[PDB]
């Protein structure tokens, strides 16, 4: 689990595997696509996957779930939120049980002890 608003982009990249995905920060530009009026505090936009969640609620309050919520600005927020929590759950588990897969871990490329050098 991430206990902050920010995370080093390299700490979630693979060292011995091809990097085909990143774990980007929340896309704040999607918040300005909502045409209606809403109140959002800047203190909630950086934490992972939450901004997409609040946007989904705003869209489900202004519109409903039938024939009015089906507009591009609102469906992309629902998709980003559903996708952000799925990737973060997978990266979080991979961080818990496979920390040696990521850059920055000392077990990705273990440094030998001095007794292993024969000096």
């Amino acid at each position: 689990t991430i206990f902050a608003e920010t995370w080093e982009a390299s700490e979630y990249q693979y060292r011995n595997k091809a990097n085909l995905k990143t774990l980007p920060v929340n896309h704040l530009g999607k918040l300005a696509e909502l045409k209606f009026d809403f109140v959002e505090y800047k203190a909630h936009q950086l934490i992972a996957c939450h901004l997409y969640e609040r946007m989904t609620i705003h869209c489900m309050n202004q519109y409903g779930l039938f024939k009015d919520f089906y507009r591009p600005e609102c469906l992309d927020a629902q998709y980003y939120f559903k996708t952000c929590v799925e990737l973060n759950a997978a990266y979080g588990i991979q961080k818990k049980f496979f920390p040696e897969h990521f850059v920055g871990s000392p077990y990705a490329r273990p440094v030998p002890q001095f007794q292993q050098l024969g000096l």
């Binding site: 085909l20 997978a90 991979q94 496979f98």
Partner: protein, 50 residues
């Protein structure tokens, strides 16, 4: 997985499920295209009307 499975490997799961549609009108268009090619073969090399 422990008894009858392999190693747990991380892969990217494609949500897009492609599938080629088995249609009828597609082969009709295909024949029309070859019918033009064959007619040109006849029009150029087996046309004796002039």
């Amino acid at each position: 997985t422990y008894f009858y499975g392999g190693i747990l490997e991380f892969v990217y799961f494609d949500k897009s499920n492609p599938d080629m549609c088995i249609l009828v009108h597609t082969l009709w268009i295909h024949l029309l295209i070859l019918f033009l090619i064959f007619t040109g073969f006849v029009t150029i090399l087996f046309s004796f009307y002039g």
